[model samples]
Target: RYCQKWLWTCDSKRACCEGLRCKLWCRKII
Candidate 1:
């Protein structure tokens, strides 16, 4: 499963769902 925005910790850019990026945690892309 993919990580939702502001809810999951990501190890890399691929860990988050679309439109979101890994910045230590999953955050929305501007």
Candidate 2:
């Protein structure tokens, strides 16, 4: 779950932060 913190924060900071959108979505489903 730690990755989510970074991913979500990154996405919030920028529009396409580290291309974490797809990973975020998959994480949610998983």
Candidate 3:
């Protein structure tokens, strides 16, 4: 929630671009 807004410019249609990167990153880390 905070990450999506604080990190990037999100549109009404979607959350964030780097969100995918974040997801993959989290998955890889833990």
Candidate 4:
């Protein structure tokens, strides 16, 4: 499953769902 915004941890941007990007952690891509 994709990482949730501002909550889930991710290694890269692709690990997050749409509108979200990974910055070591999943955050809103805005």
TM-scores of the models, in the order given: 0.25, 0.15, 0.16, 0.24
Output the better candidate (2/3) by TM-score.
3
Local accuracy of candidate 1 as per-residue lDDT tens digits, 1-30? 433554456565444565335546555552
Comparing 1 with 2 on lDDT, the higher-scoring candidate is 1
Tens digit per residue, CA lDDT, model 2, 1-30: 333333343334444423455634322323
Instruction: Give the clashing residue pairs of candidate 1, or none.
Output: none
Which run of 10 residues does model 2 get worst, by summed lDDT?
1-10
Candidate 4 lDDT, 1-30, residue by residue in tens: 433554555555444565334555555553
| Ten-residue stretch with the least lDDT total in model 3 | 21-30
* Pairs of residues at least 3 apart in sequence or in different chains that clash in candidate 4: none
- Which is superior by lDDT, 2 or 3? 2
Clashing pairs in 3: none
Model 1 scores worst on lDDT over the 10 consecutive residues at 1-10
Indicate whether candidate 1 or candidate 4 has the larger TM-score. 1
Q: Candidate 4, residue 19: CA error in Å?
A: 5.7
lDDT (CA) for every model shown? 0.51, 0.38, 0.36, 0.51
**Model 4: how far is 14 from its true place, Å?**
7.7
Question: Over 4 Å off in model 2, which ranges?
Answer: 1-11, 21-30
Error of 3 at 16 (Å): 3.0
Deviation in Å, model 2, residue 19 alpha carbon: 0.8
